[model samples]
Target: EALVDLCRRRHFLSGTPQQLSTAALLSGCHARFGPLGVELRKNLASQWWSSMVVFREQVFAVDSLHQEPGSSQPRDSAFRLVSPESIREILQDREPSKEQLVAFLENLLKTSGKLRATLLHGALEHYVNCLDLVNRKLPFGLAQIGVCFHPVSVTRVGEKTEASLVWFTPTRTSSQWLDFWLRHRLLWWRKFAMSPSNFSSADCQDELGRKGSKLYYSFPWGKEPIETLWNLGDQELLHTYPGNVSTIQGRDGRKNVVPCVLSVSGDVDLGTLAYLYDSFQLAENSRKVLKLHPCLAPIKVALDVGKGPTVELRQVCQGLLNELLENGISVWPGYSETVHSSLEQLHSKYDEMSVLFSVLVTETTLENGLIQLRSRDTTMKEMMHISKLRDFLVKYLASASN
Candidate 1:
């Protein structure tokens, strides 16, 4: 009777606690009994709520609210959603806003659950996926293919805290990707996305280079002690150095011109909190010159390797593992055996060959895209720009302290 009464009432939702439908009741209970939900019972919706829900409503028509969009669509696409805890935290900190909602959903879907859980190891996860055909990897795609670090500065370890700016990147660059970037793992599932065009040595960053600035530390509250990674270049591990990926110099048997990709890390005081933003931005010349190795490239392997049907993808997997084995690295169980053979078979064309491998370079990774231009012939302007960057960092750091 109460359930019937509740249903007949003019309330936004109907039915008693026990009488309500299961899914709706569960959602309702979470909202009503949840800590912040109790708080919202006495508060008002924030101004930013409107456009956001509207956008969600509109998008929901074509996309799933809980699942990723175009799960296995050949063309690249993005889908995202935030957790209840995150939404509550974001709201309690202050009134909610559309941008925050979008970003939260985007982050949840991109960096956290979606990639690790849903994205199966398949051929779609290969380098060939991003290629422009004719079997040559796209320079832009290669540029954006690799993974890198994203240091986020948190105010508190457990409590809800905004991140710092020294670390930022698109959604594609996941915590794993960032770990790969720093060559070390981070605590949370924090991740990002990067594409060839964004990370490539060709993208325009003249706007970022404005005010005589070459690096922009968009946010400061991220990965604490934020000063470590930025512009603190000249790490002892450069090329042929211990723990380095490629040998810095050319070998007696091989032409040593280890292509250097454009790489620069510096800071900018964006006032108050370092609103988290991109990790690195390359200059024009740097964009044109930096090159990435094919087989080891992250995106390329993720895209075309384990995607599509079983047989061929498994072959590619075997080949990938072989390369890792040759490098003395162990491959994971899902990424093991049958696929390792396939990867080994496909190596000459897929990961090893340039264009055949298509790496997924999304915006998040683009934020911290790291690559460097290689050239002994530095123009006077390039030298001037480097110095200006030095000056910019010093000034910005001091001001940030203020």
Candidate 2:
């Protein structure tokens, strides 16, 4: 009765505590950190597009299907949800284990239960099924950002965290695809995502949770690994599920289910937190600074430190805004007279507005045709000529971004 009353009163979905609906979590995120989420999504999506699409010569973007086109066979389409019974029967046949059965038993009873391996494999199969559609060569890849679900006990060491998966399919030899992706992913993190000191790369191969031994990322917080893997390749040891089925013509004009590798995030959500944590925590100084790569910083330049009301100051602020915006520099608001305050206020609120360059604009500076651009991390200020502002900012931000 209490459960019913709770659901009726709050319009909540009924489920066990573990099976609690996503609505609550999603609502909380929307209310609390929607802007942050928006920027994260935008940054990641932009990077993905630019790296995967714009920079590449042969790559072309494709949309993931809600329902795969070829639906007649289970192996051919992603439209069918592989039943737990079917999954159970297949896995039980291959390498039956006590832990596997126990996990599945509980999942089988719950209405929300899903067979994890079968589900991801099935989704990949949809892309594999599309080799004919894209008409790309053998060595190319298909990339998509999608939702993934798996369950494990928190007290238990091996439980999986829910994260939006970064799934990339590369159709070359399993060895080539797997190596390429691992290096690419790590390189991206090192160069664009976080501070150099807070994270370290794994020097050796290790077990990825209950999953098999694959490459991983080590974090400062713990050894449980904030990031792991889902290997799908041709090799028995490395690939998690190479159960791909499709026919593609090769250089010799042959047809077979293209042997490809599935490289995915073991837990994208936790990995994201680890990055943000490291990005914000690296400053040794008194300031609580969040130093992100200029590309990922929400605002590249904080245009003006609020100055007192004056026509000359306002004009200079407007001029700075137009210059920054026209030159493709991402900036925050112009100087507002009311927000003008003491130098101490500007120094204190530095963390309040996270930006790479905090520039102080005023009428006095306009008279000299110069403004002081301060670096957030080093707190070093550089005098800039108005005529050279675009060149300096564009070059500096571009270097910082790369």
Candidate 3:
């Protein structure tokens, strides 16, 4: 209300929409959104009915924060802004005189006896993107930050955002915004690392390990109020299960399992699968194994639950509990297996055909996202291989001199 009147009359808030971000979000869509999920999505159609309004102007559209290919400096890098403990940070107000407004808001929060808790300086959107969010929903996980309120704020409505403007007239003295950003490098880092956990909790630390939400925008004009404003990436991922898979040792003891999510990027292949299976075995051996029901005992091997997991992945896992029965391991079974067998059958025999077949089999797995990968890599893998597979298939699809 304070600035809205000034914004409309002066044309200060009138601007054009900026280009939307180009990155991807969420893991790959390789797995079908099965019937169960389809049923749920049907229910959501009505739930997603629109109630959106356009922003008065495009308030500083950061199409990216990371360095663009042609740039020397990173645009998406969040040097300071994190916790929206107050209003200024939330709007991403980048004008000069707005620094004064931020200070005033900070003081107002102080009068309300929350100055210490209210953040007023430092950082950029990363605080909102990757580093701040709610991350606990039991076995499944979530991490995202937005123009929402602290969990304990009583009412459902939290701090909302807008394309707010601040006039940074060529200042008479040292720039106020620059000064504000200068004092708080350490503060921003503290919050950058600190957020990424449940904001409702008194301890806002992200002690719970999970994939943090990346920079997403919530455009005023977006269809869903909560649609991602930008994409950090499209990804393929394996969800994390505790190595111990128990609540017994519980919160009293530290989390005992190894951090299971892949942390870096590089080469991926069969060797990678072998390493992951070995780790799964070590996890099964943890003391968590002692407490399962007698019926659950022999059911020790891990399951991929779909057309992706393989038997060797489970068989090689260590100290896996006693078998409930002698039933042998089964890997992901797919129609592709039949096709592979038939393709080999036609060849009758070729030197090193087994090696070629193995390559083709694994390559097919990669094509279908049998190996967990982020979405782009998954697409790239499939596309590259399909081109090669196309060449091979033509030999069979076409006739020679005959």
- A best-first ranking of the candidates according to their TM-score comes to 2, 1, 3
How well is each residue in 298-354 modelled by candidate 2, as lDDT tens digits?
Answer: 677766644444666667767778888998887666366466666546644454335
**Candidate 1 TM-score versus the reference:** 0.16
Task: Judging by lDDT against the true structure, name the best candidate.
Answer: 2
Query: How far is each candidate from the true structure, as Cα RMSD in Å?
Result: 28.6, 11.2, 25.9
Ranking by lDDT: 2, 1, 3
TM-score of each: 0.16, 0.63, 0.15
Question: Global CA lDDT of candidate 1, please?
Answer: 0.26
Candidate 3 per-residue lDDT, tens place, 244-294, comes to: 334211121233221111111111111111111111111121010011111
Candidate 1 per-residue C-alpha lDDT over 1-402 given as tens digits, one digit per residue, 9 for 90 to 100: 232232223132334555344333322222222221122221111111221122222111011112322333334323233467876898798888899878876665446533211111211222222222312211111111111112213221111111111211222332332233332211111112122212111112232341111212222222322211221112311421446433332222233232222122211111011111221123234221111221111221222223345555445445444553454332332433354444334332222111212222123223332211111113121111211322433353345222
* Model 2: residues with Cα > 4 Å off, grouped in runs: 1-37, 56-59, 65-136, 147-172, 193-229, 234-257, 266-269, 282-286, 305-309
